[PDB]
Amino acid sequence: NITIYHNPACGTSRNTLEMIRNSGTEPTIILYLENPPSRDELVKLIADMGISVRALLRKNVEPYEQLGLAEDKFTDDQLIDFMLQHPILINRPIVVTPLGTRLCRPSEVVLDILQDAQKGAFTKEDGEKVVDEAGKRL
Numbered sequence: 019n020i021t022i023y024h025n026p027a028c029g030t031s032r033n034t035l036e037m038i039r040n041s042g043t044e045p046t047i048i049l050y051l052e053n054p055p056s057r058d059e060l061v062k063l064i065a066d067m068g069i070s071v072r073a074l075l076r077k078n079v080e081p082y083e084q085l086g087l088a089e090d091k092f093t094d095d096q097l098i099d100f101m102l103q104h105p106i107l108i109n110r111p112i113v114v115t116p117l118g119t120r121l122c123r124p125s126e127v128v129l130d131i132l133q134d135a136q137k138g139a140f141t142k143e144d145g146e147k148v149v150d151e152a153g154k155r156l
């Protein structure tokens with residue numbers, strides 16, 4: 019039972035999805051840009067991820083820029099409501115498994131919450147080796 023909030027245009031997100039698969043599970047895939055979490059869900063995801071609201075914000079996207087989110091002038095709930103109204107602000111990928119929830123940045127964070135070991139060596143799409151055939155992280 020695994021869920022990934024996925025952006026196919028994002029290599030971090032692609033690598034994460036493939037590591038999930040390499041553990042032998044096909045996750046439920048949520049295209050968050052189209053189908054963002056509800057407020058309650060988003061609030062829960064953030065709590066489980068154990069990072070701050072601001073740490074989930076993606077920089078370098080149009081609403082972050084134009085809404086001036088770089089500046090320290092926003093409460094956590096203000097920031098939550100911006101994420102819900104402008105889903106590209108939600109950084110990615112977020113992964114939920116029975117073990118926990120993580121913002122998988124870098125992608126190999128997902129290894130922490132996958133219950134089953136990688137079934138063989140994993141190499142990122144740019145060639146960065148993550149685990150060898152024997153399962154050791156490099």
Ligand SMILES: O=S([O-])[O-]
Nearest residue numbers: 028076077078109
């Ligand atoms: O793809 S950017 O968020 O690092």
Ligand SMILES: [Cs+]
Nearest residue numbers: 019020045046
């Ligand atoms: Cs699932």
Ligand SMILES: [Cs+]
Nearest residue numbers: 041042043044
């Ligand atoms: Cs499985």
Ligand SMILES: [Cs+]
Nearest residue numbers: 053054055056
């Ligand atoms: Cs939803």
Ligand SMILES: [Cs+]
Nearest residue numbers: 077078079080
């Ligand atoms: Cs960018």
Ligand SMILES: [Cs+]
Nearest residue numbers: 079080081106
């Ligand atoms: Cs836009």
Ligand SMILES: [Cs+]
Nearest residue numbers: 079080081084
């Ligand atoms: Cs736009």
Ligand SMILES: [Cs+]
Nearest residue numbers: 085086087089
């Ligand atoms: Cs500004």
Ligand SMILES: [Cs+]
Nearest residue numbers: 129130131132
């Ligand atoms: Cs693990």
Ligand SMILES: [Cs+]
Nearest residue numbers: 137138151153
């Ligand atoms: Cs292995």
Ligand SMILES: [Cs+]
Nearest residue numbers: 029030143144
């Ligand atoms: Cs990269």
